[PDB]
Design a protein around this ligand. Structure first.
Ligand SMILES: Nc1nc2c(ncn2[C@@H]2O[C@H](COP(=O)(O)OP(=O)(O)OP(=O)(O)O)[C@@H](O)[C@H]2O)c(=O)[nH]1
Ligand SMILES: Nc1nc2c(ncn2[C@@H]2O[C@H](COP(=O)(O)OP(=O)(O)OP(=O)(O)O)[C@@H](O)[C@H]2O)c(=O)[nH]1
Ligand SMILES: Nc1nc2c(ncn2[C@@H]2O[C@H](COP(=O)(O)OP(=O)(O)OP(=O)(O)O)[C@@H](O)[C@H]2O)c(=O)[nH]1
Ligand SMILES: Nc1nc2c(ncn2[C@@H]2O[C@H](COP(=O)(O)OP(=O)(O)OP(=O)(O)O)[C@@H](O)[C@H]2O)c(=O)[nH]1
Ligand SMILES: [Mg+2]
Ligand SMILES: [Mg+2]
Ligand SMILES: [Mg+2]
Ligand SMILES: [Mg+2]
Lengths: 131, 435, 429, 435, 429
């Protein structure tokens, strides 16, 4: 089981756009330059693996997705991981895949709050996990 | 030019067939007396046309108890059916599979086969058989197994679709239902190309909720099932922008030899009052037909993973919005497919809007959808039936009746082991595996 | 098609039988003279099952009335509704069995049984496709039990592959009508169990309580008492006589109700039962029929089911109804009252619906329940028999009419054996 | 192209909604049946146009007791609403916050969310939800706190405007009002973008003095409140010289996340006879709307300082005199602003003169003003309510009803301190700061 | 929807109940024969709450009349308006309780409750969604207090999450109708406080004062008294029966009126009350309706509120009225009369408005006030009981039917405990 958190209007808690990208890059040791590049969902699937060991078959996802049809399959795995841990946030997959700033920024804003709630401070090397 | 024949076995089969043939006569514009006042031929596929203007259906009503067949004979559709086709016995099977398959059913099987053979030789482009039968009923189950064996022996490879009635998890009318259902599943698991599965409790709930009727007698359930059957056959009966056939259904829906138990759903099922305040768009009718509570078998597909889906739209349907809605549905969160079926939708479109029977509960609609889903959630129903059978058989109840009517306990043991093997195969195929 | 042969033995069988054919004739609209006067053609669709066609549209019934004294026969012949029975079937003896087993089963019954079997065989050959026999008798008297048992054994030999029902009248627990009850009952039940298919055990004072309280009748005569038995005795048959949305017959009921060959002793029931005054304040609908049917108070046997468990239960509804509620409420009844239901028989309810309501009623029902509570009924009878037999009382002429003490040894042992299995399955897990 | 849905909860919401939706049909020329005899669309933002010419509103009426919803069903607006939308329970919350939020409300919350998602997915450009709920009631407070928690999770960042009904200072229909109001504000504080406050006591005086009516039943008050609601969304449905949207309201009135409690005001409000002797210029209705006696909440703005305002004109309004009139208002010494808000006015002009419902008290007017002042003077209302709650809770009166229905004594303390946090938050920023 | 089950015990409960169903039938336009004859369709919108739909559109009340003697039942059955009750509900004993606690709670009441409970359960099962029970009885008699208490305990054990109201007739101070009044009253209240929800104490001579002075009636029989009581017992439940601007039900009243579990004893009121002669000189308007309610002269309990303080007060208006005067004047009443109002409960008034006026009046009202002056009623009863118990008078009649002197120790201790809390809260700051 996992704990949930909502996000409607909070002050002094939302982070800047520049800082959000630094946190994603620092946690997984990669070179995302734009936040809108997070349309792939490869980083999103890795986040669930870090939060809860197992619960996601990381072999199913692929990090070399470049097409519209390829983007969706990555999110379908994340859909099953959300159900298994019992979270109840509906991913608007029809809107993230277009790779626009609006929808991609709101989802990571919610995911940052979810990350802090279910983090026990464990650390590992994603490089060996990715390969 | 293409002909498929229908065999209705038992009281449930006969009543469902009565409703279905009323619907067909309404659809093709045939008067009850057989005369008449896309369409031209159409009725040639079902109604054989005799010397005069009269049309006679290609139906074979068979039963052992004569009450319901006499009721049909004296019913309003008396001049339509060929009197030789209606085959009746003298005493019923009395919910005894042994009696309906071994003792009694062997005394009329030859006549039934003779009538089937005459009807088949009458036609020239025979396509398949449609068998309307229940599962709990003794005569239904026994004669269905006997007919499957005989037809498979006679005609080698033809489509043989069935429209069964699965016993409800809680609602029950008989007591030997587990024995009958287990036996029939073990016997006819091998001789069936594709069996569509329908439960009475789910149809009760659908009629109560969506259509909002508090007095849903068996007529309404029969009408709904008849609508589903007509939607399946409309591709053969009528032209369309993208046609499908019985072989297409069979090929696209059965991935493995044992896993051929899909479940059906129809949409939209709304009353007359609620019709005006609804817009009835292709996307929303797809969503409603794919909604979990609209499924006509008492099982939630959310508990399992889909394996194959067949959508059939009929009416004023545009393939662009059809394909847009299907893409949205695939993107949705509730639908989760198996890893080895990257493509999981077969789509058919028909140009004939559905017709409405007079006095019926449903309202006129310009768009209709029939959904046939082969999934994994049926494993829970198989397991529940197996548990009921095991609980009853642990101390040999009614086995004295079954053995006295020419059977042995070895048959029960073999049926049990076959059902266990089928459940194990279903679960193993549905579950994911590495590499 | 599927004709049923009716056999009546004893005074109770004739009195019950005389009231029975009043209801059937009313149902099919047959005048007492014997000619059809009905309106709807549905009644004549299946008239051969009970009645028999004759010249000039006569409909004499397929009944056989037999008794050892002319007192009962003269009453039905001279009284009203006696101009339609065939006089050939009126077989009667000379002197009564005198409330004796041997005088009704060995000595006096020997000559009468040969004549009856010839009439039964003649009726059976006239049949198109026989379905089974129906026999109404008493387990306490001599003529009703002495030959009714003899008739059962002889008929069973001739037609082994048939289903026959015995609507016996179980002796009363409180007050015994005849002094030597246990000797006649115990020697009879040991015979019924061997070669009968299903018996509908009913009780006398259990009908007294039902009529006095529920029906609110101050002076229950035997005419009103036998009327109650007639309704429940014609409900079980009406499924095959009339078209219905879920048909049933004698054979279909027996398969569901009889899990084991020995366990075929049932408890009937009927609903609705309302007084003349209080019928105007009840909404005739399915929710109240099932509640009235399932309570232990409205039961026609001197047995309270709360001390036992319902093995299997069947309800044969009548009239016109919507089967959403017919099977919705039985699910509710089963779940709420799951304590008194066996655990190794899942979904133990059989339901059938007809389409022709009984006369003067919108909807009705009939409840047949195979329950464990009958265990105590045979325990009480065996208890009385054991005490009487130990002192060697009243059998100085049972042995004197052919029988012997050796015969009693198996009869008591069989009865005690049957109640052991009946009780054992109640506690089985 | 722009869609916003409205949820009416409790008797107060339904009774207000019955009067409000009567106004929209008049504005867009929609007959009560649904047919019809700036406009090209207009009604698409509220009325979803179905297959025929009929239009059905985008409303969700939810209540626990079936007494008032049934009145709407049988009322004159019987054919308008979609029959499925009207959601009813079985028993009311009985002025108990715990019953309408924990015990009774939970059994119907899932059904309501089902209809919300069906309507939201039908639309394409959804902006926000309009919630019409009271404060003192059980289902209007306990249940409406459940909807905010559920709605916010499903839709992340959307507008959520509440048109509440503050309990009056002296007038009081119920007796546990302090218990319900204190609990609701602490729960829905974090899930509301902008809540408009309306008090019944202040409207009585406005109708008595300005309108000169001595018989102000609840029908008359709801007509006057409904005009405020229409002017808020009047810019979406109609063109104008300077348009505003639902988001612009939210960004211009809320300096801090906790401080989002403005109070409405309408002008002009005059009777039929007094209308002729008044010239009704733009420069005076702006003055009229700023008078302390015309404010719709029983609190004098003179005791506090304004933080932000929002004017909304409509009709034959020319922007030159609008800006001239506001300049004179600013220099008046009765109106005083806070130091850290040098700019304190937002304007919006529309070209649609307000319409009048037949039989209404208000007269035909070619100009109208709706004012949304976010002022510090509302801090007095919080202090008064907190005084009542602290008085009764000290001796633990009426608590045994709340505790026994699925609550804890500890939960009361958390809601008490939260309101104390808001009370000094409201003052510490409205008061000046050094440097 | 939200059906209410009505139970009447004792002679007073039957006599009050007989006049009660006269008012309800008049309100809904139900003919004495039991068929609807009304004109406005609003009455039939909610008819299932009190009445029950039966066959042929005949309506039967949901009432259960029970008494230990056949004297009261015979009068209501043979008299007028006795053709609509269901005869099954007419439950009665054979011998009266004899104005005894034990004879009505242990000995004679034991047999009746088993039969009554089955009728209650049958009625509740027929219900769609139960709302609560209503009981009208007496606190001084034997069967009205004896069995009424037993009925309360048995029903409470089966339906714990339900709200039920008891409209008891409290004993009168100056004149005692039965000699041993305190023994029955004290032993009853100790039971009501435990397992009842909300109770309206109604006095007898306070009704004499209202009828003689306000209504100006020289010879008030029991028909005129029971008519006065019925208006209050119909005005309470009229909010959920008819549409209104500000609705209310049974549950809404209980939440507002009962701050603490033990403090649920109320005092009713009614207005307007005018004679036939003086009705033409007063204009029916809200200003005088509220004035007639709050004065101590127009109250149904013989306890002057000027000696106490109103904890909380309800007011259920009827008819058509402007909502401004409804809220405008109650504030004026509160400010002017602030001396007799509790300080730690601000705004302690609850008001509901209906939209259907009572028969033959433009508008009316009903006033229910949970005051502190009830304390003086319990002090008087406890004082009488303590003095009588000290001499051990009449006690050897209660001990002979099961009870003992040990049972009395808590009954008096509980009553003294309850009045201690009632006093302490009046002076609490
Ligand atoms: N959907 C549907 N099912 C029916 C209908 N009529 C009967 N059934 C099913 O049929 C079952 C009863 O067994 P049947 O197949 O009718 O057997 P039968 O025709 O009576 O013949 P026997 O087996 O010999 O008794 C019940 O469990 C029902 O579920 C019907 O009209 N519609
Ligand atoms: N239902 C019903 N049962 C009856 C009626 N009259 C008698 N009985 C029962 O049937 C039994 C009658 O005895 P029978 O078996 O007919 O014996 P019999 O006719 O007197 O002839 P013998 O045995 O030789 O004395 C009695 O024990 C009664 O319990 C009746 O009118 N209705
Ligand atoms: N403005 C306005 N307010 C109303 C109206 N009707 C009721 N109210 C308010 O609603 C409050 C009554 O509680 P509600 O919110 O209606 O509670 P409910 O809807 O009856 O549901 P319950 O709390 O379970 O009884 C009163 O304090 C009034 O202030 C109305 O017609 N107009
Ligand atoms: N309001 C009202 N009260 C009455 C009326 N008649 C009697 N009472 C009161 O009710 C009490 C009657 O005693 P019950 O409780 O009915 O006792 P019972 O029915 O006579 O039966 P027993 O207790 O065995 O004597 C008396 O003490 C009266 O105070 C009446 O007509 N109207
Ligand atoms: Mg059959
Ligand atoms: Mg005799
Ligand atoms: Mg309410
Ligand atoms: Mg008395």
């Amino acid at each position: 089981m996992a704990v949930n958190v909502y996000s409607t209007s909070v002050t002094s808690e939302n982070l800047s756009r520049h800082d959000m990208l630094a946190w994603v890059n620092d946690s997984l040791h990669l070179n995302y330059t734009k936040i809108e590049q997070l349309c792939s969902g490869a980083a999103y699937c890795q986040f669930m693996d870090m939060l809860f060991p197992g619960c996601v078959h990381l072999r199913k996802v692929k990090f070399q997705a470049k097409l519209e049809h390829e983007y969706i399959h990555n999110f379908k795995v994340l859909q099953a991981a959300f159900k298994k841990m019992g979270v109840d946030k509906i991913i608007p997959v029809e809107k993230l895949v277009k790779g626009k700033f609006q929808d991609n920024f709101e989802f990571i804003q919610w995911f940052k709050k979810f990350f802090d709630a279910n983090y026990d401070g464990k650390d590992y090397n994603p490089l060996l996990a990715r390969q | 030019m293409r002909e498929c024949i229908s065999i209705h076995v038992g009281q449930a089969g006969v009543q469902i067939g009565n409703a279905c043939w009323e619907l067909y006569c309404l659809e093709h514009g045939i008067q009850p007396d057989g005369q008449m006042p896309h369409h031209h031929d159409s009725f040639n596929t079902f109604f054989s046309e005799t010397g005069a203007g009269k049309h006679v259906p290609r139906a074979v009503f068979v039963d052992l108890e004569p009450t319901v067949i006499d009721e049909v004979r004296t019913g309003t559709y008396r001049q339509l059916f060929h009197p030789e086709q209606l085959i009746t016995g003298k005493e019923d099977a009395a919910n005894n599979y042994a009696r309906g398959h071994y003792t009694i059913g062997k005394e009329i099987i030859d006549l039934v086969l003779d009538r089937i053979r005459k009807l088949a030789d009458q036609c020239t482009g025979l396509q398949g058989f449609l068998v309307f039968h229940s599962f709990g009923g003794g005569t239904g189950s026994g004669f269905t197994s006997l007919l499957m064996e005989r037809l498979s022996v006679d005609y080698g490879k033809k489509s043989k679709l069935e429209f069964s009635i699965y016993p409800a998890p809680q609602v029950s009318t008989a007591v030997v239902e587990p024995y009958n259902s287990i036996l029939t599943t073990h016997t006819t698991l091998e001789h069936s190309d594709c069996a569509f599965m329908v439960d009475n409790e789910a149809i009760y709930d659908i009629c109560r909720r969506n259509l909002d009727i508090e007095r849903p007698t068996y007529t309404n359930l029969n009408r709904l099932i008849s609508q589903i059957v007509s939607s399946i056959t409309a591709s053969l009966r009528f032209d369309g922008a993208l046609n499908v056939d019985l072989t297409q259904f069979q090929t696209n829906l059965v991935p493995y030899p044992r896993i051929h138990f899909p479940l059906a759903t129809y949409a939209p099922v709304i009353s007359a009052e609620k019709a005006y305040h609804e817009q009835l768009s292709v996307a929303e009718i797809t969503n409603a037909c794919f909604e979990p509570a609209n499924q006509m078998v008492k099982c939630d597909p959310r508990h399992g993973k889909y394996m194959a889906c067949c959508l059939l739209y009929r009416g004023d349907v545009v393939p662009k919005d059809v394909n847009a809605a299907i893409a949205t549905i695939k993107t949705k969160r509730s639908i989760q497919f198996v890893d080895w079926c990257p493509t999981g939708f077969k789509v058919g479109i028909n140009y004939q809007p559905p017709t409405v029977v007079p006095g019926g509960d449903l309202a006129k609609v310009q768009r209709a959808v029939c959904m046939l889903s082969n999934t994994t959630a049926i494993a829970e129903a198989w397991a529940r039936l197996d548990h009921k059978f095991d609980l009853m058989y642990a101390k040999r109840a009614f086995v004295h009746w079954y053995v006295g009517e020419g059977m042995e306990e070895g048959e029960f043991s073999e049926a049990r082991e076959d059902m266990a093997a089928l459940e194990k195969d279903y679960e193993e195929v549905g579950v994911d595996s590495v590499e | 098609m599927r004709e049923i042969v009716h056999i009546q033995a004893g005074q109770c069988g004739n009195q019950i039988g005389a009231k029975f054919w009043e209801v059937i004739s009313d149902e099919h609209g047959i005048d007492p003279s014997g000619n059809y006067v009905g309106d709807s053609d549905l009644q004549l669709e299946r008239i051969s099952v009970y009645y028999n066609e004759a010249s000039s549209h006569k409909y004499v019934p397929r009944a056989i009335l037999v008794d050892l004294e002319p007192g009962t026969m003269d009453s039905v012949r001279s009284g009203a509704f006696g101009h339609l029975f065939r006089p050939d079937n009126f077989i009667f003896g000379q002197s009564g069995a005198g409330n004796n087993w041997a005088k009704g089963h060995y000595t006096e019954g020997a000559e009468l049984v040969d004549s009856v079997l010839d009439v039964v065989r003649k009726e059976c050959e006239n049949c198109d496709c026989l379905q089974g026999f129906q026999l109404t008798h008493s387990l306490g008297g001599g003529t009703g039990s002495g030959m009714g048992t003899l008739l059962i054994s002889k008929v069973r030999e001739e037609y082994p592959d048939r289903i026959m029902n015995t609507f016996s009248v179980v002796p009363s627990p409180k007050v015994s009508d005849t002094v030597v009850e246990p000797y006649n009952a115990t020697l009879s039940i040991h015979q019924l169990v061997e070669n009968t298919d299903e018996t509908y055990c009913i009780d006398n004072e259990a009908l007294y309580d039902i009529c006095f309280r529920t029906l609110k009748l101050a002076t229950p005569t035997y005419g009103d008492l036998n009327h109650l038995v007639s309704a429940t005795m014609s409900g079980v048959t009406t499924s095959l006589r009339f078209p219905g949305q879920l048909n049933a017959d004698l054979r279909k009921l027996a398969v569901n109700m009889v899990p084991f060959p020995r366990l075929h002793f049932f408890m009937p029931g009927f609903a609705p039962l309302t007084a003349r005054g209080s019928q105007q304040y009840r909404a005739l609908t399915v929710p109240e029929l099932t509640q009235q049917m399932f309570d232990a108070k409205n039961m026609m046997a001197a047995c309270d089911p709360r001390h036992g468990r319902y093995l299997t239960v069947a309800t044969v509804f009548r009239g016109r109804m919507s089967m959403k509620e017919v099977d919705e409420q039985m699910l509710a009844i089963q779940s709420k009252n799951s304590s008194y239901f066996v655990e190794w028989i899942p979904n133990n309810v059989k339901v059938a619906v007809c389409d022709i309501p009984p006369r003067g009623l919108k909807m009705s029902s009939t409840f047949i329940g195979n329950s464990t509570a009958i265990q105590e009924l045979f325990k009480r009878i065996s208890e009385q028999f054991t005490a009487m037999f130990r002192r060697k009382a009243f059998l100085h002429w049972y042995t004197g009419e052919g029988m012997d003490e050796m015969e009693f040894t198996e009869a008591e042992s069989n009865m005690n054996d049957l109640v052991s299995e009946y009780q054992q399955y109640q506690d089985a897990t």
